[PDB]
Nucleic acid binder design. Structure first.
Lengths: 82, 90
RNA sequence: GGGGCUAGGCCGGGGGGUUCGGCGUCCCCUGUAACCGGAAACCGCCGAUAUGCCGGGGCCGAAGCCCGAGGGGCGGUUCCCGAAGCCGCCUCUGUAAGGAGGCGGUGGAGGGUUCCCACCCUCGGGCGUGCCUC
C-alpha cells in the first residue's frame, strides 16, 4: 500500500528486500516538470510505495538507495548492521 | 541498451535529468544482480547490484560490486542531490 | 542420454492523443541480463489477413510461442455520493484595509462502484516437441 510516513516505509521496505533479495526491485520516478517524486519497492507479490513534494526527502532517499546498494553487494544481508 | 562503467553512467544520468526538465519522467531502478548474460533453462556472483535509468527514449545502466560501491555511493548521492532540486522547502 | 545442425523463439508491454481504422514518431503509466543505426504529422508502414517501415546485429534453440480462466498487483477509467481551499449575495457581530453563519457557484481531499491494465503466480487448452551422428 501507500505510506505517508517515510520511516514506516523505509523500515518495511528493507524488511522485504531481506526476506528475498533476488525477487525484489527498487524504483524511483522523478518528475521535474510537475515537481514530484515517487519511490517503489516490490517483489511482485507485495508492493510498497511513497510519493512526495518535499525537498527534505531527497536526502532521506540518498541514504535509502545508498544502503540498499550496500546490502545488495553483501553475501548475506542479514549480517550487515543498520 | 547502453551498458556503461560508472563514470559515463553518472555523466549520462546527469544528462537524462536535465532533458526531462520542462517535460518528461526519469525512472531509476535498482536490483540485486546475478551476473546473467543469458536466460535460465529447464555461474552466479553474489556481490553485484544493477542500476537502470531511462526517460522513455534512451536507456542506460551499470553494474556495481563491493570493489566500487564505497566510491560510487557518494558520487551518485551527490548527482541525486544536484539534480532532484525543484520541490518545496518549508 | 552425449555431440552437431536448422526450423522456430526472445531482444519489452500497456493507456492517452491523433486517425474511418491498425501500428509508429508526440504525452503518460510500466518491465528485462538483454538490442544497434536511419526516415517519419497536416507525415511514415499498413487495411479488420491492418497491432509499424528500412538496414545491421546478439542470444536461446526444438526451444518454445499462442488462447482462455482464476489469484496477487501498478496505472488508468465509468458512474453514485462527497472533505480542505477559493468567488459572490444576504444576516449577526464590531472597527481586525476583519471574523461567525445562511445560500448558490467554483472546487474534488476521500469513499462505494464499472471497464481496462505494466509486472508476478497457478490451473486448463491450442500448434510444435524436427534432422544428422554416437
Amino acid at each position: 500500500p501507500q505510506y505517508q510516513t517515510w520511516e514506516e516505509f523505509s523500515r518495511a521496505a528493507e524488511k522485504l528486500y531481506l526476506a528475498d533479495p533476488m525477487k525484489a526491485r527498487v524504483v524511483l520516478k522523478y518528475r521535474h516538470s510537475d515537481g514530484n517524486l515517487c519511490v517503489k519497492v516490490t517483489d511482485d507479490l507485495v508492493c510498497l510505495v511513497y510519493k512526495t513534494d518535499q525537498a527534505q526527502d531527497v536526502k532521506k532517499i540518498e541514504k535509502f538507495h545508498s544502503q540498499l546498494m550496500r546490502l545488495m553487494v553483501a553475501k548475506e544481508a542479514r549480517n550487515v548492521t543498520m | 541498451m547502453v551498458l556503461l562503467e560508472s563514470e559515463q553512467f553518472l555523466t549520462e544520468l546527469t544528462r537524462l535529468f536535465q532533458k526531462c526538465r520542462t517535460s518528461g519522467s526519469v525512472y531509476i531502478t535498482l536490483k540485486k544482480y546475478d551476473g546473467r548474460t543469458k536466460p535460465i533453462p529447464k555461474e552466479p556472483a553474489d556481490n553485484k547490484c544493477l542500476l537502470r535509468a531511462t526517460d522513455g527514449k534512451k536507456k542506460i545502466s551499470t553494474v556495481v560490486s563491493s570493489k566500487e560501491v564505497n566510491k560510487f555511493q557518494m558520487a551518485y548521492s551527490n548527482l541525486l542531490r544536484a539534480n532532484m532540486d525543484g520541490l518545496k522547502k518549508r
